[PDB]
């Protein structure tokens, strides 16, 4: 069983990942944040959120309306399945949640939620394989 995985966040609005596949024997899963190259928080913060595919929009818009100092989330949304906290360059943030919130026939996505980084293409899939 493979119950983590990292994933990093880089000073090019990227992650080096599209895809998260959570293998449904894990009764936890791990994701490590980490965020190479030379930019702070306040210009290129990254954090990892998930939600469902649905709740992406709506999670995204709310969180950039809350702003950086809310690490770009609604406090306490309950459509944040699992998030790590805003890192800049150097810095790192791990997450672990129960895959018993994780369902068959629903679509999760993952992403980033700072100021329009999602809709830049931060973001990708979680899978329960
Ligand atoms: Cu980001």
Redesign the pocket.
Known sequence: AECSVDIQ?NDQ?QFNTNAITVDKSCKQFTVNLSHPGNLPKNV????WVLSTAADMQGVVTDGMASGLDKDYLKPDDSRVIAHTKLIGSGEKDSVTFDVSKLKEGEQYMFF?A?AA?AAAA?KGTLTLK
């Open positions: 966040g609005m290129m913060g990254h954090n980033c700072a980084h931060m």
